[PDB]
Design an enzyme around this catalytic site. Sequence first.
Site, PDB file in Angstrom:
ATOM      1  N   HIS A 216     -28.732 -53.533  70.096  1.00  0.00           N
ATOM      2  CA  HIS A 216     -27.284 -52.859  69.538  1.00  0.00           C
ATOM      3  C   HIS A 216     -26.441 -53.810  69.543  1.00  0.00           C
ATOM      4  O   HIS A 216     -25.418 -53.745  70.237  1.00  0.00           O
ATOM      5  CB  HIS A 216     -27.199 -51.691  70.442  1.00  0.00           C
ATOM      6  CG  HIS A 216     -26.228 -50.512  69.959  1.00  0.00           C
ATOM      7  ND1 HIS A 216     -26.254 -49.205  69.996  1.00  0.00           N
ATOM      8  CD2 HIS A 216     -25.021 -50.913  69.151  1.00  0.00           C
ATOM      9  CE1 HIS A 216     -25.079 -48.457  69.537  1.00  0.00           C
ATOM     10  NE2 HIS A 216     -24.539 -49.427  69.149  1.00  0.00           N
TER      11      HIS A 216
ATOM     12  N   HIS B 132     -23.002 -55.454  67.618  1.00  0.00           N
ATOM     13  CA  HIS B 132     -22.111 -55.471  66.538  1.00  0.00           C
ATOM     14  C   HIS B 132     -21.758 -56.898  66.330  1.00  0.00           C
ATOM     15  O   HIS B 132     -21.218 -57.544  67.279  1.00  0.00           O
ATOM     16  CB  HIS B 132     -20.639 -54.737  66.846  1.00  0.00           C
ATOM     17  CG  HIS B 132     -21.195 -53.118  67.118  1.00  0.00           C
ATOM     18  ND1 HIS B 132     -20.606 -52.343  66.134  1.00  0.00           N
ATOM     19  CD2 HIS B 132     -21.934 -52.565  67.979  1.00  0.00           C
ATOM     20  CE1 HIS B 132     -21.042 -50.916  66.307  1.00  0.00           C
ATOM     21  NE2 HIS B 132     -21.557 -50.919  67.482  1.00  0.00           N
TER      22      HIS B 132
ATOM     23  N   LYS C 219     -29.084 -48.617  60.006  1.00  0.00           N
ATOM     24  CA  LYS C 219     -28.286 -47.820  61.252  1.00  0.00           C
ATOM     25  C   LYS C 219     -27.696 -46.459  60.536  1.00  0.00           C
ATOM     26  O   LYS C 219     -26.719 -46.663  59.490  1.00  0.00           O
ATOM     27  CB  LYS C 219     -27.224 -48.572  61.570  1.00  0.00           C
ATOM     28  CG  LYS C 219     -25.988 -47.860  62.705  1.00  0.00           C
ATOM     29  CD  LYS C 219     -26.715 -47.493  63.764  1.00  0.00           C
ATOM     30  CE  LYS C 219     -25.676 -47.078  64.786  1.00  0.00           C
ATOM     31  NZ  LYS C 219     -24.620 -48.059  65.350  1.00  0.00           N
TER      32      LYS C 219
ATOM     33  N   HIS D  96     -24.722 -43.850  61.343  1.00  0.00           N
ATOM     34  CA  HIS D  96     -23.773 -43.777  62.242  1.00  0.00           C
ATOM     35  C   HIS D  96     -22.763 -42.539  61.464  1.00  0.00           C
ATOM     36  O   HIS D  96     -22.502 -42.428  60.479  1.00  0.00           O
ATOM     37  CB  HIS D  96     -22.801 -45.082  62.169  1.00  0.00           C
ATOM     38  CG  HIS D  96     -22.089 -45.322  63.531  1.00  0.00           C
ATOM     39  ND1 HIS D  96     -21.016 -44.521  63.844  1.00  0.00           N
ATOM     40  CD2 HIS D  96     -22.278 -46.003  64.523  1.00  0.00           C
ATOM     41  CE1 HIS D  96     -20.453 -44.842  64.761  1.00  0.00           C
ATOM     42  NE2 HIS D  96     -21.033 -45.695  65.057  1.00  0.00           N
TER      43      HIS D  96
ATOM     44  N   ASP E  25     -19.792 -42.209  61.655  1.00  0.00           N
ATOM     45  CA  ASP E  25     -18.529 -42.649  61.136  1.00  0.00           C
ATOM     46  C   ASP E  25     -18.638 -42.848  59.488  1.00  0.00           C
ATOM     47  O   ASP E  25     -17.566 -42.945  58.928  1.00  0.00           O
ATOM     48  CB  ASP E  25     -17.740 -44.029  61.713  1.00  0.00           C
ATOM     49  CG  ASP E  25     -17.323 -43.920  62.992  1.00  0.00           C
ATOM     50  OD1 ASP E  25     -17.444 -42.605  63.802  1.00  0.00           O
ATOM     51  OD2 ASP E  25     -16.961 -44.959  63.485  1.00  0.00           O
TER      52      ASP E  25
ATOM     53  N   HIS F 215     -26.825 -43.136  65.586  1.00  0.00           N
ATOM     54  CA  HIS F 215     -25.764 -42.798  66.491  1.00  0.00           C
ATOM     55  C   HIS F 215     -25.359 -41.410  65.630  1.00  0.00           C
ATOM     56  O   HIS F 215     -25.106 -41.273  64.435  1.00  0.00           O
ATOM     57  CB  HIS F 215     -24.653 -43.521  66.399  1.00  0.00           C
ATOM     58  CG  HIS F 215     -23.169 -43.085  66.923  1.00  0.00           C
ATOM     59  ND1 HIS F 215     -22.537 -44.074  67.570  1.00  0.00           N
ATOM     60  CD2 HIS F 215     -22.456 -42.036  66.614  1.00  0.00           C
ATOM     61  CE1 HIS F 215     -21.313 -43.432  67.803  1.00  0.00           C
ATOM     62  NE2 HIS F 215     -21.174 -42.138  67.109  1.00  0.00           N
TER      63      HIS F 215
ATOM     64  N   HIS G 201     -27.654 -45.260  72.232  1.00  0.00           N
ATOM     65  CA  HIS G 201     -26.945 -44.808  73.666  1.00  0.00           C
ATOM     66  C   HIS G 201     -27.158 -43.248  73.661  1.00  0.00           C
ATOM     67  O   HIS G 201     -26.472 -42.539  73.455  1.00  0.00           O
ATOM     68  CB  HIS G 201     -25.233 -44.942  73.445  1.00  0.00           C
ATOM     69  CG  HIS G 201     -24.756 -44.915  71.972  1.00  0.00           C
ATOM     70  ND1 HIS G 201     -25.083 -43.471  71.279  1.00  0.00           N
ATOM     71  CD2 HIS G 201     -24.584 -45.843  71.197  1.00  0.00           C
ATOM     72  CE1 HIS G 201     -24.602 -43.679  70.026  1.00  0.00           C
ATOM     73  NE2 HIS G 201     -24.254 -45.110  69.889  1.00  0.00           N
TER      74      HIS G 201
ATOM     75  N   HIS H 258      -9.829 -44.059  69.959  1.00  0.00           N
ATOM     76  CA  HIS H 258     -10.045 -43.288  68.822  1.00  0.00           C
ATOM     77  C   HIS H 258      -8.536 -42.744  68.549  1.00  0.00           C
ATOM     78  O   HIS H 258      -8.095 -41.603  67.734  1.00  0.00           O
ATOM     79  CB  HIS H 258     -10.752 -42.145  68.988  1.00  0.00           C
ATOM     80  CG  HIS H 258     -12.135 -42.405  68.894  1.00  0.00           C
ATOM     81  ND1 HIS H 258     -12.980 -43.320  69.702  1.00  0.00           N
ATOM     82  CD2 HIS H 258     -13.376 -41.901  68.163  1.00  0.00           C
ATOM     83  CE1 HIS H 258     -14.156 -43.366  69.447  1.00  0.00           C
ATOM     84  NE2 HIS H 258     -14.345 -42.386  68.477  1.00  0.00           N
TER      85      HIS H 258
ATOM     86  N   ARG I  19     -17.412 -35.558  75.520  1.00  0.00           N
ATOM     87  CA  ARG I  19     -18.309 -36.655  75.292  1.00  0.00           C
ATOM     88  C   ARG I  19     -18.527 -37.392  76.484  1.00  0.00           C
ATOM     89  O   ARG I  19     -19.684 -38.056  76.642  1.00  0.00           O
ATOM     90  CB  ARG I  19     -17.573 -37.298  74.243  1.00  0.00           C
ATOM     91  CG  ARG I  19     -18.393 -38.874  73.960  1.00  0.00           C
ATOM     92  CD  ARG I  19     -18.049 -39.319  72.481  1.00  0.00           C
ATOM     93  NE  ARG I  19     -18.470 -40.723  72.530  1.00  0.00           N
ATOM     94  CZ  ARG I  19     -17.988 -41.646  71.502  1.00  0.00           C
ATOM     95  NH1 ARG I  19     -17.705 -41.222  70.126  1.00  0.00           N
ATOM     96  NH2 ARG I  19     -18.615 -42.722  71.786  1.00  0.00           N
TER      97      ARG I  19
ATOM     98  N   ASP J 178     -24.283 -52.849  72.607  1.00  0.00           N
ATOM     99  CA  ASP J 178     -23.408 -52.251  72.030  1.00  0.00           C
ATOM    100  C   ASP J 178     -22.152 -53.182  72.002  1.00  0.00           C
ATOM    101  O   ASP J 178     -20.898 -52.771  71.672  1.00  0.00           O
ATOM    102  CB  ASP J 178     -22.769 -50.719  72.511  1.00  0.00           C
ATOM    103  CG  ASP J 178     -22.512 -49.912  71.323  1.00  0.00           C
ATOM    104  OD1 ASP J 178     -22.032 -50.314  70.409  1.00  0.00           O
ATOM    105  OD2 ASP J 178     -22.362 -48.526  71.545  1.00  0.00           O
TER     106      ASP J 178
END
Lengths: 100, 100, 100, 570, 570, 122
Positions: free
Chosen positions: E137, E139, E220, E222, E224, E249, E275, E323, E339, E363
């Site tokens: 995981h 980035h 992946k 995601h 988003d 995700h 996760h 966020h 969350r 992550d």
Amino acid sequence: MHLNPAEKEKLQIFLASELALKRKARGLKLNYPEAVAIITSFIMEGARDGKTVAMLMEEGKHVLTRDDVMEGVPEMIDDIQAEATFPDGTKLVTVHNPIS
Amino acid sequence: MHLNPAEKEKLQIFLASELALKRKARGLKLNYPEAVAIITSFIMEGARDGKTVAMLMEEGKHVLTRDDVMEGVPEMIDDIQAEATFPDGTKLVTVHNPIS
Amino acid sequence: MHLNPAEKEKLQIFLASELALKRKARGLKLNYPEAVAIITSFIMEGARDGKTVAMLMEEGKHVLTRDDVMEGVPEMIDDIQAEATFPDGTKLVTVHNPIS
Amino acid sequence: MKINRQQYAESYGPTVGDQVRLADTDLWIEVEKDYTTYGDEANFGGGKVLREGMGENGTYTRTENVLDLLLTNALILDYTGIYKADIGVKDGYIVGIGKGGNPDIMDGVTPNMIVGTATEVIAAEGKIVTAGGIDTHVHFINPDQVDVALANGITTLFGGGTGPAEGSKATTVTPGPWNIEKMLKSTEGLPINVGILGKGHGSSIAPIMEQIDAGAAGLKIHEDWGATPASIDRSLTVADEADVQVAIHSDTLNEAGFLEDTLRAINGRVIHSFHVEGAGGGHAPDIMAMAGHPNVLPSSTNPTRPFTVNTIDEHLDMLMVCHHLKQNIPEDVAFADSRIRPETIAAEDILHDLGIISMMSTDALAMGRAGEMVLRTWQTADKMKKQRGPLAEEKNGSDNFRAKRYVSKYTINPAIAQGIAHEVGSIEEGKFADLVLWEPKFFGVKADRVIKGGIIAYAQIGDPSASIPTPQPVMGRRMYGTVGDLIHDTNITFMSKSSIQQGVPAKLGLKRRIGTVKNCRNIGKKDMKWNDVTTDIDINPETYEVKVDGEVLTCEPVKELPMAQRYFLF
Amino acid sequence: MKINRQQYAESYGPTVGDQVRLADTDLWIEVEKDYTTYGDEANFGGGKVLREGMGENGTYTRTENVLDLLLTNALILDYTGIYKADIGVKDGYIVGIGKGGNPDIMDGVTPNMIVGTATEVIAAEGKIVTAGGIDTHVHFINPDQVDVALANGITTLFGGGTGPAEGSKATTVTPGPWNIEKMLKSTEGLPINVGILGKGHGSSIAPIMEQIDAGAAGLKIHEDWGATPASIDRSLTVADEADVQVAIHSDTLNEAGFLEDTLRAINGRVIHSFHVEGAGGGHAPDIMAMAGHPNVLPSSTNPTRPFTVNTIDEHLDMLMVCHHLKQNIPEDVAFADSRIRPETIAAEDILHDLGIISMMSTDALAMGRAGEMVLRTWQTADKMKKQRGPLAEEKNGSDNFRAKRYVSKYTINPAIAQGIAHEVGSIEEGKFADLVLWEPKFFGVKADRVIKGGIIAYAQIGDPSASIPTPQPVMGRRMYGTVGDLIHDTNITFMSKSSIQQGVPAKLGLKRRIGTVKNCRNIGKKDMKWNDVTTDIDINPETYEVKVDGEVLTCEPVKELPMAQRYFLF
Amino acid sequence: NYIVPGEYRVAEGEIEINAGREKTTIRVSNTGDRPIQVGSHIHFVEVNKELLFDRAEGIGRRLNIPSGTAARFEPGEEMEVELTELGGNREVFGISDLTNGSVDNKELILQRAKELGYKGVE
Ligand code: NI
Ligand code: NI
Ligand code: NI
Ligand code: NI
Ligand SMILES: [O-]
Ligand SMILES: [O-]
């Protein structure tokens, strides 16, 4: 903080100056890199304080005297140069023969 | 200043030592890297002061005691080594079991 | 010492904070990177002292006030973030609007 | 019109008869001759001489006797002389030592040293220029070691290692075809010349020889791998066939033989004896006797250099802790005491001075300091002048004889020993342009600029954000010669003839210049410039006292050295 | 003659029945067996065993059963066992685990583990040796993240990103053929193994599939980018055809479905649930129920690992500020509260301990710490031992069962999930020599040496200017494996079969070793070593309390962890 | 419950080295004027010529000491050492070039040792 390359580098001069000042405070005659660091940091802090290039040109000749440094160090240092951010932007200071 | 690679690196040890000394001054038991930094910087400053390798071998065993550091730190440090410029050039100091 | 990359980097924050504190001690209004360095180092030292994330979230809003810094600096800093090793491991602290 | 000699020296650097102090030592070098024509000196800048139609020729294309680079007004310190000249570089090689400029209008211009449109200029007035140092005892342990070496004027690293593996931490060895291939690849990214030594151990030829074919430039025999008669014998048989050098760290323990046994195995063949004094390793206590023999090329490593008040305490402790020896174990103590000896270290200073040990080297990161070969060479020369006086051979009150003897130890002599002196090791026409400029005040301490293959690789230079390059912090920094593909053209990977013939470079995709190791097997002590003395060295087995020609060689340790606390921040 | 077990352990590392504390935790691992022959232990140094004619064979060429590298006296901690062995490496692969040396004179020598002329030595006596960590995981946001990962013993990064672009800052995605090509090129300069994930989003096959053909190693999904039923479905159809893994995700917002909808889209196909606890993302609040299913390979990311007093405050604030959520907006607060849940984080500790979550991951730089996967794995095991006691399965008072269960989470299990366990993820014969040495005192905290493809890439090592490598400052540093072209041979770029068949490496000029992703589509939970448990996980929608087999899974947060303030300068 | 990070808790008992191999004690004298230290795994018959002992008793053998340790003989020192049997194929190559094959060739080893002046060929 957004440090640029020069800001990261010039942190080293301040640190070397702090080290040298501690060495002088415990009674050592300072060596070549020590003396250079002290006077350089002095110039950069002077610019931060808002002094002029002319003021720092004068003051830099009186930060250390020959009895502060080892034999030959005065003659090894012909001039010390530093660039710092004055109130009116980056300028170059050259201190000629800082230790007589 | 004409800093060589080691001079740039060893500035970090002094800085880590300053940080650790401040932490000890406000009453913290020091951790592994803190303790190492303090004793290392002590050796390098001792060489700068003109002490001998034998003196620093002795003194380095009395800079920090077990009540200065967290549980297990004395047993984690078997010896601390530093090279510095003595009056007679670069020499290696090894302090064995610096914290009893 | 076994410094990892972050330990080497974060030494710079402490050093920048020391520099900024000296500048504040001689009466300067601090600039953007100075203010950031001071509050960041404060957070990292707070974690070292064993304070909680909640405590540092509160305290970080009272390290510098608008009269400590130049015009516009309070409005340039929306929040300052730092990660440090707390007693319970690495955690993230965000101080929101540190200077009102 | 006449210029007084003080003003002349300040403008153009010193001229015939002038002397210059080396850093803060008591050593003075004197200009022996000067290639210039007084009044036609080359110099570069506003209203200066190297301008088109004037001292710069505006007619000739690069091919037509024009230089890529002129170093103006260099004071050369080299085994070949101490003298004033312009140095002309082209295609990365020194093509001309003499007088550069424009034959249109200047007298005395060396015909292939025209400054033309294609010429870069480096001002060497007021600088001392030497060959790049050749360090033949390098452990490849930590890549950060390279800049350390560049900053003290070293330009060639010969040795071995795969990084901080125990084999490499003890021995200058890259073992076997695969490790050698891997390190040849690694070398593509190291901004310094390199040659790699394989393991000089085995009882069959093939396992040793396949390392040479794989790309090794030489072999290292090390006691930690078994410095047995057989390993010595096979290595030398391989070396005689392959035309490469063998270095030896002999059997300190005297386990399979004493010194005489090692000498018998060697059987008159050429060998490089590492840290010949023996603190760094070898037959206890008499290894240094190697340095008397005609077939031995002897080097010291640098921590014994020179003998100081801290030396013994530092070394005893170093040995003990690095071999995990205990102070309460009498065998450990006995071993330490048999290996670290004031009698041999003191004698080592004098053997250097007498030209009996020919070479200096670091032992970088195993028992030596990567950035102090040059530094300690001069500290040693200085100590010897203080304790022994000007050498008989000196004249004019200069230290020129001693300076040539000593500069030879880290430039030409290691190059000759390794079989690479056709490429490197001296400032001579036809050799690779590895050049170090020094401010005299920093001589042997911190290099100003290190030129690799005619391009600056390393420089003490300041703030990259400044209006000019000199503002603080001035520190050692890699320059353009190290960046991108230029790192390939400015550096040499030295390799065996057989690996080159077998196409190893093409097989591994090496882009660096490839240098051939050769003429390693029919040299001797007599081939070591200014350091060619053979004699019977006696080392008393009881007292450790060293005798040469019936006289004990002893000197005192010094409490202080030049080139030390005046210079170094730590 | 006999040696007491304290002295034996000090000289050779521990042997059968001996236990070693992991760093400053309460966890003890016990040596299960030892491949040695007592008295014929291998070791390297002055007067030691691996010398020619002795423990080093002087006859055989490299091809003839001789190693490139022997790690002597390793204490291996691996899913396959906790045991004492020499490890033999050749051509960059582990070829032999057993007993190295010389069959001339030693009993019990594994036939392909001869120490010969070609052999390098690493002393592993007194060290713990593990596989390099596999972080799935990642980035790719800031290249400085690589050393961070190496320093905590990670050797493979799987994930995505183009640097600090918003897409990459949120998601492990290198989108489209061009970005994937660019990052494959970038990868040539990253001293770590890499596999790149494309965007697992689209409603037609072709836009997704062309990323695999371009060189992606996986996909992946995601939220988003829209973690919709369609994006899930197409990704899995592509993955089934291409033989690569899909990470998900899921739709935290439950916008197009609840967990059951995501499971329906997945339709029994294999998927890696990132996760899985859900603080890092997924169907609020019940995502962690994924970890009960047979077709799910579940990983945690590291900031919830393990549950501590600072965890919740840290996470609530982190979520809100990242966020751009406002504390005065009830929808924002409601979202945060839905969350970040102590009930699921506490249960996550226990699900790890029970073998229900199979994998750890970072992550890195999106909501996780690049250099703390290994660190937090052990802190979690330690916390669980403190709160739950020795697991039933333990014996001899050791923590071996727990240690194998936990080491599996960041070594073999991610490798299996990704389809790369033929190359990496464990210390087994035939796998790539990615090996991490640890001083037990620093175990899981700071790696001593990281071996990549049989050459050290990264080491905690000291002053490069020193006589020896240990003087201060000791810090993490890149070693020779990272330099020049050696970076190509020591690291693997993992790629889809189709990109490899289509010649993408040659097209882009990739010089790194190319690893094939394969056998990703017919594995399940049952294939996760020591972590193979399937069960019905119930997450109460009102209270968030987690049940398994009718029992609430809850534990307390701890105020303090091991592997923390004793070690870290900040 | 004081924590020493990474500490060992070794099991009880002792490790016997070279178990089940024949042991032999012999007297050995350093007739030289310089110290000789002998490692655990050198073929004993091939040690320094100036060590005097019954060379035949060193054939096929090495010191019975822990792997990686050495016996030290100061100049003039005579002491007893214990030898154990070489294992594996019981062949030796290189070192001093006295064997270069099976250790069973006693006659040939001793003839070579004698010709080269290895002390104590009887
Ligand atoms: Ni050596
Ligand atoms: Ni060496
Ligand atoms: Ni996510
Ligand atoms: Ni992520
Ligand atoms: O050495
Ligand atoms: O994530």
